[PDB]
Amino acid sequence: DISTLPRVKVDLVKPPFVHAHDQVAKTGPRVVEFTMTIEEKKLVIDREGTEIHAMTFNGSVPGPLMVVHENDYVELRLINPDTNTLLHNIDFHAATGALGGGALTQVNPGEETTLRFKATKPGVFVYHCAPEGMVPWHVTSGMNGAIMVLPRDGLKDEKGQPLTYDKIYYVGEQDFYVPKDEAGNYKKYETPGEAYEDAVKAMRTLTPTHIVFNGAVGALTGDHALTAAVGERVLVVHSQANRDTRPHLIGGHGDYVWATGKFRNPPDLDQETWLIPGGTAGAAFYTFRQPGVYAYVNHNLIEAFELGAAGHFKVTGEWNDDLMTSVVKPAS
Amino acid sequence: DISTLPRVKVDLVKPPFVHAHDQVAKTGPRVVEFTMTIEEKKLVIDREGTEIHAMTFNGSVPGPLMVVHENDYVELRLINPDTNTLLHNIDFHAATGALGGGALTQVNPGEETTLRFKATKPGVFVYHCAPEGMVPWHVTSGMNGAIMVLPRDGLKDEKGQPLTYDKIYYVGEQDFYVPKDEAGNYKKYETPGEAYEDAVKAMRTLTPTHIVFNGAVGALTGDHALTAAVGERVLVVHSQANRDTRPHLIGGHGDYVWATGKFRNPPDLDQETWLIPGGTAGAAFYTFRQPGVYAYVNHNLIEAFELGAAGHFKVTGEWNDDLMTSVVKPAS
Amino acid sequence: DISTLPRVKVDLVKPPFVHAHDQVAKTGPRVVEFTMTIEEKKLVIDREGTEIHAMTFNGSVPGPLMVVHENDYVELRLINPDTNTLLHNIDFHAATGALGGGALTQVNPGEETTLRFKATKPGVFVYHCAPEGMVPWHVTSGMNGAIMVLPRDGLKDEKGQPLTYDKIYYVGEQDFYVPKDEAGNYKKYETPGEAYEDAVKAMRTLTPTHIVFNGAVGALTGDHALTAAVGERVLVVHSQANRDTRPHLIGGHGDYVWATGKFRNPPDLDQETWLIPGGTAGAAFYTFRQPGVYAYVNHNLIEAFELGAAGHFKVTGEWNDDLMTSVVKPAS
Ligand SMILES: O=N[O-]
Ligand SMILES: O=N[O-]
Ligand SMILES: O=N[O-]
Ligand SMILES: O=N[O-]
Ligand SMILES: O=N[O-]
Ligand SMILES: O=N[O-]
Ligand SMILES: O=N[O-]
Ligand SMILES: O=N[O-]
Ligand SMILES: O=N[O-]
Ligand SMILES: O=N[O-]
Ligand SMILES: O=N[O-]
Ligand SMILES: O=N[O-]
Ligand SMILES: O=N[O-]
Ligand SMILES: O=N[O-]
Ligand SMILES: O=N[O-]
Ligand SMILES: [Cu+2]
Ligand SMILES: [Cu+2]
Ligand SMILES: [Cu+2]
Ligand SMILES: [Cu+2]
Ligand SMILES: [Cu+2]
Ligand SMILES: [Cu+2]
Numbered sequence: 001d002i003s004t005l006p007r008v009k010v011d012l013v014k015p016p017f018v019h020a021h022d023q024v025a026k027t028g029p030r031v032v033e034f035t036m037t038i039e040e041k042k043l044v045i046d047r048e049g050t051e052i053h054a055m056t057f058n059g060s061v062p063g064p065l066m067v068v069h070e071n072d073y074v075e076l077r078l079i080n081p082d083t084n085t086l087l088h089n090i091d092f093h094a095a096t097g098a099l100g101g102g103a104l105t106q107v108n109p110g111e112e113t114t115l116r117f118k119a120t121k122p123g124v125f126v127y128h129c130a131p132e133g134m135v136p137w138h139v140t141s142g143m144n145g146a147i148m149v150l151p152r153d154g155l156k157d158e159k160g161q162p163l164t165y166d167k168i169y170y171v172g173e174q175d176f177y178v179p180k181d182e183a184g185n186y187k188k189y190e191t192p193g194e195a196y197e198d199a200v201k202a203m204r205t206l207t208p209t210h211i212v213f214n215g216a217v218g219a220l221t222g223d224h225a226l227t228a229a230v231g232e233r234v235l236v237v238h239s240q241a242n243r244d245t246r247p248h249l250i251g252g253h254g255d256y257v258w259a260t261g262k263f264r265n266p267p268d269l270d271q272e273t274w275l276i277p278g279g280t281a282g283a284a285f286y287t288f289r290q291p292g293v294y295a296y297v298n299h300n301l302i303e304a305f306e307l308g309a310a311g312h313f314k315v316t317g318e319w320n321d322d323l324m325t326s327v328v329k330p331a332s
Numbered sequence: 333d334i335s336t337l338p339r340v341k342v343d344l345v346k347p348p349f350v351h352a353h354d355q356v357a358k359t360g361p362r363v364v365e366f367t368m369t370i371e372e373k374k375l376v377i378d379r380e381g382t383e384i385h386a387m388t389f390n391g392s393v394p395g396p397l398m399v400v401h402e403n404d405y406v407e408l409r410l411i412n413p414d415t416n417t418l419l420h421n422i423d424f425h426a427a428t429g430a431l432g433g434g435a436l437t438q439v440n441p442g443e444e445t446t447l448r449f450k451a452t453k454p455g456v457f458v459y460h461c462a463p464e465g466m467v468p469w470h471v472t473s474g475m476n477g478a479i480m481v482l483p484r485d486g487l488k489d490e491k492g493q494p495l496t497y498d499k500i501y502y503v504g505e506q507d508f509y510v511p512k513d514e515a516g517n518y519k520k521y522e523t524p525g526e527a528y529e530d531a532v533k534a535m536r537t538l539t540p541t542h543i544v545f546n547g548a549v550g551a552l553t554g555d556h557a558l559t560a561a562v563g564e565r566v567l568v569v570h571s572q573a574n575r576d577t578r579p580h581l582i583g584g585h586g587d588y589v590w591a592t593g594k595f596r597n598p599p600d601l602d603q604e605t606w607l608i609p610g611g612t613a614g615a616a617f618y619t620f621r622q623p624g625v626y627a628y629v630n631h632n633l634i635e636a637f638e639l640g641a642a643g644h645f646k647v648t649g650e651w652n653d654d655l656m657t658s659v660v661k662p663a664s
Numbered sequence: 665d666i667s668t669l670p671r672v673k674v675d676l677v678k679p680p681f682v683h684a685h686d687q688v689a690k691t692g693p694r695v696v697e698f699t700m701t702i703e704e705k706k707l708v709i710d711r712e713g714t715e716i717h718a719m720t721f722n723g724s725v726p727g728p729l730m731v732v733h734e735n736d737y738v739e740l741r742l743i744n745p746d747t748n749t750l751l752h753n754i755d756f757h758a759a760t761g762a763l764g765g766g767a768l769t770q771v772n773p774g775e776e777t778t779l780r781f782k783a784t785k786p787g788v789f790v791y792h793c794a795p796e797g798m799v800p801w802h803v804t805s806g807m808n809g810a811i812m813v814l815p816r817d818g819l820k821d822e823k824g825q826p827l828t829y830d831k832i833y834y835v836g837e838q839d840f841y842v843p844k845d846e847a848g849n850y851k852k853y854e855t856p857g858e859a860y861e862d863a864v865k866a867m868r869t870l871t872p873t874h875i876v877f878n879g880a881v882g883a884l885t886g887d888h889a890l891t892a893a894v895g896e897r898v899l900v901v902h903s904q905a906n907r908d909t910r911p912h913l914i915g916g917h918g919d920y921v922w923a924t925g926k927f928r929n930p931p932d933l934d935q936e937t938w939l940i941p942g943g944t945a946g947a948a949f950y951t952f953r954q955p956g957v958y959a960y961v962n963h964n965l966i967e968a969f970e971l972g973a974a975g976h977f978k979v980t981g982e983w984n985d986d987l988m989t990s991v992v993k994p995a996s
Contacts, residue, residue: 135633136633260600270787272787280578327778457936597933
């Protein structure tokens with residue numbers, strides 16, 4: 001009887017950060033309430049000033065990570081304000097039935113809806129918009145995110161001992177297919193609707209023009225680099241709603257990796273690089289052992305360094321010469 | 333001594349259906365006899381009426397699923413009637429030696445041959461045509477299928493308890509590379525041979541023009557949708573002979589997945605999406621919990637919704653509001 | 665205290681062969697010393713005489729396999745002679761910190777450097793050049809290889825019993841992106857530097873013009889085919905520094921496969937085809953059961969047979985009719 005269950009309202013935060021939560025559940029099952037507002041907005045995605053009409057959950061690409069526990073109920077109030085122009089909905093890969101909620105959440109501009117589903121399977125899962133007949137257009141315009149459903153007793157290693165993370169980040173990787181004129185310059189449009197048929201042609205090439213973390217080339221760099229300290233245990237959740245990716249931490253590893261993101265399976269150990277299939281979220285756990293700059297990339301290095309799929313960690317602490325040292329610095 | 337073993341003749345059925353078989357073996361090892369006839373035929377693959385010269389085992393794309401048990405012998409009579417124009421053969425990934433039977437099964441039009449091999453490894457495996465110097469052309473013209481080699485005691489879960497399916501379907505996913513003129517219209521040819529050099533150029537782009545389940549855009553929809561009932565246990569065998577795919581059941585999961593299809597390994601649990609590498613067959617087990625329409629797709633959603641890699645299940649039975657419910661229907 | 669550890673100098677050999685080593689460690693931890701010389705050289709990559717300016721470790725594509733044990737120290741003297749024109753460095757995916765050694769090994773022509781790192785994780789790992797701002801160009805010009813870090817007690821199967829290989833081969837798979845003029849003919853340049861901007865455009869298509877094993881179309885064929893005998897246990901290490909691949913032994917299997925190459929995980933059994941993500945090394949163990957020619961391919965068969973990703977084994981010994989036999993040879 002759902003009426004006798006506690007409700008808890010969560011306010012979401014912008015990626016790559018994640019809302020506050022407990023790893024090990026401190027309560028019985030709850031109805032966890034979330035609200036998201038759909039925003040269609042102009043987004044500048046590269047250093048050249050290329051602009052697209054992005055379609056977002058809550059103003060960000062990706063949409064925010066939602067965190068619950070196994071056998072909680074998720075109740076999502078989804079709002080499409082009348083400032084938008086398109087019909088939208090939501091499909092949770094975590095949910096069972098009705099096209100993941102897609103059949104039940106069709107909202108025109110000016111409408112809202114509330115969906116509830118039981119989180120029966122633990123893991124990280126993609127969610128994404130999926131309106132009838134324009135599914136890939138919405139998804140590849142940025143309308144996707146992820147939800148993590150923790151087991152009620154937290155994460156476990158391959159022997160079933162606890163794994164406790166100190167920090168968690170969410171990296172959403174996005175393939176864009178910006179239409180091009182005859183010479184190869186990116187086209188500009190006043191509304192999303194204008195772009196529709198050129199978008200379809202661009203997608204059909206199967207060749208993205210940009211592949212980015214957190215909505216833009218260089219988004220997870222500089223002042224916006226992810227941070228950690230030597231000794232910290234970090235969980236990186238990574239999603240790709242449409243296309244395969246292969247994350248790699250340059251200078252590090254994935255100590256424990258759920259590459260297809262489902263926590264009832266044991267993790268793969270000591271990964272250099274792992275494959276997250278399109279339409280999947282994965283998760284990797286690493287303990288930092290050396291300070292400095294690390295690059296986190298899609299290890300198709302063209303996709304990383306030319307198309308944009310690269311971010312940085314900056315890690316503080318003490319250098320360990322046992323692990324690595326320059327014996328003779330570069331010299332004639 | 334093979335002469336003292338029982339023989340059993342099996343008549344194959346059209347995909348997505350699968351010939352009758354026992355999961356748990358009710359006999360000792362047998363020689364299982366199959367016959368296939370090669371058909372070169374014109375196939376219409378999309379709603380626009382695009383036509384290719386398909387090369388088929390038994391008239392279908394994919395070829396039919398063959399089902400045996402571990403340590404049976406498979407004896408295949410392969411017929412190439414003199415109405416065809418090309419040399420063909422067969423390579424079973426399930427078999428050991430002679431290029432999977434390819435070296436021993438070269439048949440010109442008007443010839444036949446009988447191959448026998450022992451099924452030593454349990455799993456689902458691709459089979460495909462592979463004639464010297466035109467391997468990808470034959471395969472990507474539809475000349476592939478799969479064979480399932482069940483363990484003699486049926487399938488097991490990750491703890492080794494029995495898994496029994498109530499229904500089984502075979503989804504063959506096919507990448508086509510239809511040649512195009514300068515403007516981008518699909519070309520037409522009178523014979524397969526005419527197309528050869530344009531086919532090679534089309535393949536080399538590595539960009540398929542269509543990606544389809546069961547031989548055509550929309551083949552597993554409408555009257556041809558796959559069916560099940562709430563509570564039923566369904567095994568979907570999925571093959572791709574040439575290119576990677578990432579299946580996903582929209583509104584469902586892969587409860588138990590052998591993504592690379594080999595049953596001595598434990599299955600991955602609770603998958604949202606899984607990667608089947610090109611040249612592989614995989615298998616996914618799901619128990620339906622909600623009625624309605626489900627879409628089964630390649631979750632590169634461009635490949636699904638624009639290029640054709642999407643089918644439907646229609647599931648009958650009772651709606652469970654505990655799992656999912658609309659709390660507030662879409663409204664102003 | 666590293667000064668009290670034995671040192672051992674290893675001389676590397678050309679791929680596909682691998683330097684001599686012990687599977688089970690016969691000594692305690694050592695400092696293993698290697699030397700590599702960077703060579704920029706003109707390479708002919710196909711039968712048409714297409715030429716590129718390759719960038720190599722030790723003169724080969726791939727660079728040589730290095731073999732150590734878990735918790736050895738690797739000490740690499742890296743030399744960039746003043747006959748080269750570019751700045752180079754090295755990133756080991758096996759190492760921890762400083763961008764895998766990349767931050768510490770930047771050498772202009774005429775410089776050398778010595779790096780030491782501790783091999784803390786067992787597996788096969790990619791190494792590759794990664795200079796600031798031209799990472800994919802160097803990697804996709806051939807500047808990559810792999811290192812294997814054996815567990816001190818050798819390899820184990822999925823039950824933890826020993827697996828001992830009789831032979832080991834290293835297959836490096838390389839994606840090239842040779843620039844093309846308007847009509848589609850490959851361009852030629854006098855220096856590597858000349859090619860830079862055309863290279864970037866070619867890479868951005870994400871479409872390789874060639875995909876080869878060991879540096880050229882047909883390199884592992886004819887007199888250069890890999891060899892084995894029926895009954896032998898063979899380990900094939902396969903790396904791809906930039907793009908996904910899906911190896912398959914035609915006529916065989918991967919009996920034990922570490923597709924993402926990390927030996928603390930149990931192997932997948934009985935694989936037909938397996939996925940090695942870009943930026944990864946994997947390893948497959950097979951025991952030959954039939955003599956003859958086997959083709960080892962990337963099972964995107966366009967990539968294999970049209971673009972070059974195919975090699976051969978030639979296996980000697982006795983034919984086993986129990987496993988496979990022609991019952992009726994091809995006939996009218
Ligand atoms: O500015 N909204 O697409
Ligand atoms: O747009 N909410 O009524
Ligand atoms: O679906 N492309 O990885
Ligand atoms: O194909 N996805 O990198
Ligand atoms: O679901 N992969 O851990
Ligand atoms: O009509 N046969 O290709
Ligand atoms: O074509 N059969 O003899
Ligand atoms: O081989 N293409 O997935
Ligand atoms: O690359 N296959 O979707
Ligand atoms: O072979 N994969 O279960
Ligand atoms: O000939 N050296 O690029
Ligand atoms: O190039 N070595 O000094
Ligand atoms: O990154 N391409 O497989
Ligand atoms: O996408 N690599 O075959
Ligand atoms: O790391 N894969 O065995
Ligand atoms: Cu939308
Ligand atoms: Cu989806
Ligand atoms: Cu054929
Ligand atoms: Cu094959
Ligand atoms: Cu270099
Ligand atoms: Cu790397």
